[PDB]
Structures are given as structure tokens and as C-alpha cells.
Amino acid sequence: HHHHHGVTGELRRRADGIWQRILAHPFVAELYAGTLPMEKFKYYLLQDYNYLVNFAKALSLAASRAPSVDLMKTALELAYGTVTGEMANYEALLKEVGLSLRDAAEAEPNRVNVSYMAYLKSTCALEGFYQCMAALLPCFWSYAEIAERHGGKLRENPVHVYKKWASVYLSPEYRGLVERLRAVLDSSGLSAEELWPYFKEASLYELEFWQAAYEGH
Amino acid sequence: HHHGVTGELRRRADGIWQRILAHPFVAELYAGTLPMEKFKYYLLQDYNYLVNFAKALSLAASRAPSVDLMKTALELAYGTVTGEMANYEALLKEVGLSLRDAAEAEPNRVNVSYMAYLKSTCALEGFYQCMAALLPCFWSYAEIAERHGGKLRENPVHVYKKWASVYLSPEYRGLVERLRAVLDSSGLSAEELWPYFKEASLYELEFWQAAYEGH
Amino acid sequence: HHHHHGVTGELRRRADGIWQRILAHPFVAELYAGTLPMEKFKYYLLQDYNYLVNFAKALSLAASRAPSVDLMKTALELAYGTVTGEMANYEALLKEVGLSLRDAAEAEPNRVNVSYMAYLKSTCALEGFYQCMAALLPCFWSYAEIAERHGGKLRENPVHVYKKWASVYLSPEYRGLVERLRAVLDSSGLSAEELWPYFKEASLYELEFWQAAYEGH
Amino acid sequence: HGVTGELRRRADGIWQRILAHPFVAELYAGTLPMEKFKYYLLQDYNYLVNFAKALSLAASRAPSVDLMKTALELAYGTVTGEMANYEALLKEVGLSLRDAAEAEPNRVNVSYMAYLKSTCALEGFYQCMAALLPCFWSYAEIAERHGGKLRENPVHVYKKWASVYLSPEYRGLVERLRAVLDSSGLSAEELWPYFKEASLYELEFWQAAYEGH
Ligand SMILES: Cc1ncc(CO)c(N)n1
Ligand SMILES: Cc1ncc(CO)c(N)n1
Ligand SMILES: Cc1ncc(CO)c(N)n1
Ligand SMILES: Cc1ncc(CO)c(N)n1
């Protein structure tokens, strides 16, 4: 309840309907429980890796237009940090699961992936810096909160790769990317209302992305 | 209309295009049986589209690899403010909707996605790849007209007929024709351009469906 | 006197130092007087078409993120109304002087040209829409004011091409362009201070451009 | 040896002027007046910010995941490497980040920053890299040439400034950027105009910093 401090708290609360569906999504619950079929995870990894590449490009775009040096530093940190944290982890997860980077490059993105990646890049290439951040926040934050909610099931999760995947989102370093991004938005000088459309769309794509990964769309 | 790279693209997208061509929204629209509320809903959505479409052409224009290609991109763009957009401005007014209503209409999810796809592409990808993403949007509407044009003669609704007149017009067809020749002169293969032509085509299908369900 | 009004008037008056140097530049005075050596004009035409081409692209970029349909409609007009006007005539100015569009494509831009074109494109790709307009205004406005100042010497100007060149910048269609550009900025709600850096740099480039054209750089 | 070697050789006339520039020679020797260094730090810090933005743009358009990573590592390594140093240098010399934000860029700086951002937002990825290479590489080579004068350079800040360009980590950014270009699939000739313009700006930038513009 105390995360509901400022602008970003307001945004999170407005998206509660969406986020509760994300938090309660069967893909998520199964993944953390250890019951998710490995083929679905494989399919998810292929899709999500492509999303991360394009997510890094989106951060790059936002960085190209940061209204201050510090803000530019934050976006770059989020971008290199995405390559150095998540993507490195994914690269290793693919390898352990018998998928190559070439397989990744050859995996066709599903429709939601195309649309979501498009939305983030479009926004980050054309909208105000803080609007971009608002569009990028749900991606970062939802994954942390998902972890914060289903973390307990990991101790009973028999699958090693699912646990390794989840470890990033429980890590203080990842929660710090989240905290840092929220701090940027809470001090942006802009209202929750101005930021809402961006935060909302991205949140809706996060829900469709999990669904798409669940039904191997 | 199957003689070069764009013909190759069209034929590879046949599965998708046939679904578009046979979509109930389209058939009803040309037949004159489409409920006015669905048309209104469609007009609101499509304006936001066209505005963003214009921006996409602008972006593509911004890095045409030749003056000619830029001049082209740029015409299609301005010609989208005074060509399709002008028309739509009237069509709305006749239906009792203001530009303000247009500005206030929330785009549906497909519209957001599609607009994002075109702008994203046009801001980032090679000029020809952008054109390949933009072609289905232009061409499908011409072909839709080429297919359902006959029903207009029996179509009792004036606004639907006025809407359709643009896509039957030689000026629109020529636009389409020129756009193809740009691509067919690109010197790139179909498979290089396929992904872009495909996605856009898929969006066109989802757009009609979204307009049909009042999404 | 009545170009003293609002934000753009403020900008003009701050750039007075720079603008008076432009308005009194020998290239300009000789061009209107009819004394400018044809070779310098030819050189100028080669450079300036490359400019106009890139100017068009810059408008296109600004258009790409106009914050309103009206503002966008404008940008798009200038960008196309630059292929349609200025660029169209220039094509005739060159043909008359025995230079082809191919010659234009092959003319290497001088360093100022490169720099200026880069500045406009860079700005229009990255900066706020109004900031872009502020960068673009000097280019438009200086040429009108140059005409407003040296227009009288045209009746005594024996060179037809120079007079044809000048006719655009005396035309109500061009002068109005400037008027609309100014009103766009004057209604922005942005201060002079915020727009100054962009107006200034462009103005400095206009001065260097004339100098470069004068010395055959 | 490869495409980038070809580029360097073609720009030899320009680079020898950069390598022999009095600003550079004085900076490494320790004879550069502190006011000129201060003036340079203000200008160059602004340049590095915009240089990072340029790399960001080029990254947004990398034709491969790996290429996107390289640009990203260059951009971020520019923040955490060179920019962090300049921040320490500015502070040690009594200049704030605010002073930096308020410093008006000189004409060459505006033009050079514009060139890089223009290119990186609109040209092919490898053309961008060709535009960015001279910036990175010239500084390494300058260091490679004037490094010896440092041992006896009495000025600490000049030495600290130079330390980055002698460092294996900075040379690695350079080597990695060359390798990207050497295997780009493109000719020296296609890349030349970009490498050249940047090189010419590097020379004007030093001159501008020397004359206090
Ligand atoms: C679709 C998606 N959203 C968010 C994340 C976490 O940044 C991810 N890896 N993938
Ligand atoms: C969605 C859509 N596609 C194409 C056109 C015609 O360019 C249009 N008006 N709307
Ligand atoms: C350099 C220059 N500036 C302005 C104009 C007028 O837009 C022009 N034609 N050339
Ligand atoms: C002007 C300039 N060129 C190159 C470097 C090295 O990246 C720098 N810091 N500044």
C-alpha cells in the first residue's frame, strides 16, 4: 500500500484491474509453480528475447532525447543493464534449453509481440521522454511485482530454468532499475493523468503478451 | 498484378488478403447494409489512423535514399492531408461528427498497434522496407474497391458511396501504381520485404474486424 | 516597427547583431545590385539546392512529431511546399544557368552547408516541435527581410536570373509563409529564452553560409 | 590493414594536423594554460553528452543484436568511462555540472554534435560507426603519440584526463569499433565521407578550444 506514494503509485492503482489479471495469469502462476510445460517456456523465451532486443532499442531512443544528462544516464543504464542482466540471463537460458541465438533470430514474433515492440519503439522515438518512461515502466515493474507475488512457490518449484529465469526479477539489482525508473517519473513534474495512456497501453500489452505465450499463438 | 516483387508479395499474402476482401464490414459497406453506427465508429478510428499514416510517410520521407524517392514519399504524405484526410473530414461532418469528436475518439487496440507499427517502421527501417509496410494499406483498399465496386450501383447510402469513390478513383489507383513501381524498382527481393508487407496486411484484417465489432 | 510584437520579435531583436551582418553581407548586396559574379551565383545555387533538399527533410521530421494536427499540417506543407516552391524554382534557376540536377547531386556541399544541414536535421529529429520551428524560422525570415532591404536595387539590376531568384522572397506567398511561421511560434506559450539558442545557431549559420558562398569555400 | 586502416591512411593529412596540434602538444606537455583546458572541458563535456545520444540513435538501428550491443556498450562506456572522468575533472577544477549545462557550445561544437546526431539518426548503421570512429580513434592515437611527455607533465588534471585514452579499456572500445567496420561488408570508399567529415571536425574542435573561440 505504501508503494502508492506518488504519480507512479497512482498509475499502478488505476491499472489495478489490468495488473491483477497479469498477476493471476496462468502462464505466470504455472511458471513460478513449476508446472508450466517446457514447450510454452521455450516459445516464451524465443518471443521474449526478441522483445528485449527491441526493448533495448526503445530505451536507446528515449535516451537519445533525455531532457537532462542525468535522465540520459538513466535510460542508458536501463538499456545496457537490459543487455547485461535480462538478456545475458536469457541467452544462457536459451542455451541451457537447447536453443541457439540463431534460433532466436529466426523465431517469428507473434502479433502481440510485433504490436508491443512497435508501441514501445514508436513511443520512444516520438513522444516526450517522461511519456516514454511511463510506457516502459509497466514492463519493468509488472515483472518485479509478479515475482513479489509468486516468489514463495519457487522453493517448491522443481524446474531449474524457471527458477533461474525468476531470480533476476527478485534481485535487488532489478528492483533498483524499477525504483530508479519510478523515481524519475514521480519527480517528472507531470501528472498521473498525463502519463496514464502510456502506462495503460503497455500494461494491456503485458497481459496480451502472457496470454499469447500461454496459447502458443 | 503478379509480374514483379510486389506481385510476389501480394500473392504470398493471398490468404490474408482474401479474408480482407471477404470481410463482412467491407461487403456490408459496399452493399449499403452496414449499420451507420459501425461506419461512424470506423470513421473515428480511421481518421486517427490517417493522421498517423501521414506522420509515417513523413518519417519515411525524412530518409529517402534519393530526391525522387523523397519527393514521392512527401507527396503521398501531403496528398494524405488533402486527399484522403480532406474527404474523411467531410464524410464525418455529413454524419454529424466534428474534428473535435475525432480528436476525442479513443483509438482501439488494433488502431494503436497498427499506427505504432507503421510509425515504428518508418522511423527505424530501410526506406523500401517502410514502403513495403505502407503498400498493403494503400493497395488493399484499391483492391477492395475493385472487388466490391459493382454493389455501389445498388448501394442506397450516399456517405458509403462517397467514402468508396476515392478508392475507385484513378488518382488513388495511380498512387497505388506508383508506390508499387518504387518497390518493384528497389532491387530487393520479396522475402526481404515480406515481413513488412505481411504484418501490415495482418493489421488491415484486424482493423476491419475491430471496426466490425465496435471493439 | 510592427515586427517588435511577441516572442519572435524578441528573438529577432536579440539576433540583431547577427542579422545586420547578414543584411549587409556583400554577397547579398551584390546579388541584389546585380554586381555579383555569375560564378559565385552558380556556386551558391549548387550549395543551396542541397540545402533545400535537406531543409525539406528537416520539415518532414518536425512534422513527424507535431503536437497537433494543425501544427503537423503546417510542417507537412512547408516540407512539400518546399519541393513545390523554392526547390521547383531553383531547378529552373539552375537549368537557365546551364547546370543540371545531376550537377546538383554531384556538387559537394561546403563545410558550413554540411554543418547547417546537420544542425537542422539533428534539431528536427530530436528537439521539441517549437524548438525546431525556432531553428527553421531564421532561414525563412532572413531571406524575406533581406529582400525587404535590398528589393529597391532590383529595378536597377541588369541580371535576369538574380531578379528571378529574388522574386520568390518578395512574393506575398513567401512573406506569408514567414508570417504563419511566426504566429505558430508566437502562440506556442514558450518564452524567447527557451527558443533563443535555436534561433541563434540557425542565424549564425545563415551568416556563415553567405560568407562561404562569397569565398567559394 | 583493413577498411579502417584504409580510412586512417586516407585521412593521414588531417590526422597529422590533429596529432601535431598545439592544444594537444601543450596538454600532454603540461604547458597548456588552465583557462584553455577549462574552456575545453566545458565544450567537450557537452560534446560527450551528445556523443552518447548519437551512439544511442545508432543503436536504435543496429542491423543485428550484436551490433546493437556494441553501440550500447560504447554509449554506456562513454558515460561510465570518459564522462565520469570529466565530471571528476570539472569538479577538481572548480566547475559544476550546472556550469557545464550553462556553457554555450562554440560553433564547431554545435556543428560537430549536429553532424554526429544527424548521421546517427538518418544514415546506415555502419556509416554512423564510420562517423564515430575518428572521435574515438584519434584520441587513442593522440595518446599513443604524446604519452611519453606525461611522465614529466607537472599538471595532475591533464594527466588524469589523458589516462583514459591510454587505458586498455578505451583502446578496446576503439578496437571493437574498428572490427565492426572492418567486417561491415562495405568498402573504405563508401565509409570515407563519414570518416572524413568527423576527422575534419576533430581538427576544428581542437583549434576552437585553442583559440577560446
Ligand atoms: C514482455 C516482457 N515484459 C517485460 C519484461 C521485463 O522487462 C520482459 N522480459 N518481457
Ligand atoms: C486502415 C486503413 N488502411 C488504408 C487506408 C487507405 O490508405 C485507410 N484509410 N485506412
Ligand atoms: C541557406 C538558405 N536559407 C534559407 C532559405 C529560404 O528557406 C534558403 N533557400 N537557403
Ligand atoms: C571532441 C572530442 N572528440 C573525441 C573525444 C573522445 O571520445 C572527445 N571526448 N571529444
* C140 ligand 3 Cβ < 6 A: yes
- In chain A, residues with a C-beta closer than 8 Å to the C-beta of C64 are 126
Nearest to B107 by CA among B204, B213, B24, B215: B215
Q: Do A53 and D68 touch (CB under 8 A)?
A: yes
- Could you tell me if A41 and A162 are in contact, meaning their C-beta atoms sit under 8 angstroms apart? yes
Q: From the list D110, D118, D197, which residue is nearest C121 (CB)?
A: D118
AA letter at A166: A
* C48 ligand 3 Cβ < 6 A: yes
DSSP state of D105: P
* A206 ligand 1 Cβ < 6 A: yes
Resolution reading in Å = 2.5
Helix-helix angle C129-150:C69-83, to 10 degrees: 50
Q: CB-hemisphere CA count at 13 Å for D147? A: 11
Q: Long-range pairs for D92-101 at CB < 8 Å and ≥24 separation?
A: D92/D157, D92/D160, D93/D34, D93/D37, D93/D38, D93/D41, D93/D157, D95/D38, D95/D41, D95/D42, D97/A69, D99/D42, D100/D42, D100/D45, D100/D46, D101/A69
Grid cell locating B214: 465496435
- Percent helix, percent strand, percent coil in chain C, to nearest 5: 80, 0, 20
How many domains does chain A divide into?
A: 1
CATH code for position A155: 1.20.910.10
In this structure, which ligand is nearest to the CA of C90? Answer: 3
Closest ligand 2 atom number to CA of residue B138: 7
- Among chain A, residues having any CB pair with chain C shorter than 8 Å are 64-65, 126-127
Grid cell locating A131: 511519456
- Could you tell me if D52 and D39 are in contact, meaning their C-beta atoms sit under 8 angstroms apart? no
Q: Do A123 and B116 touch (CB under 8 A)?
A: yes
Rounded-to-integer distance, Cα C9 and Cα C6, Å = 5
CA angle C118/C120/C125 to nearest 5° reads: 95
- Convert chain B into a string of H (helix), E (strand) and C (coil): CCCCHHHHHHHHCHHHHHHHHCCHHHHHHHHCCCCHHHHHHHHHHHHHHHHHHHHHHHHHHHCCCCHHHHHHHHHHHHHHHHHHHHHHHHHHHHHCCCHHHHHHCCCCHHHHHHHHHHHHHHHHCCHHHHHHHHHHHHHHHHHHHHHHHHHHHHCCCHHHHHHHHHHHCHHHHHHHHHHHHHHHHCCCCHHHHHHHHHHHHHHHHHHHHHHHCCC
Q: Please give the backbone phi and psi of residue A26, each rounded to the nearest 5 degrees, phi first.
A: -60, -30
Q: What domain range is A20 assigned to?
A: 1-217
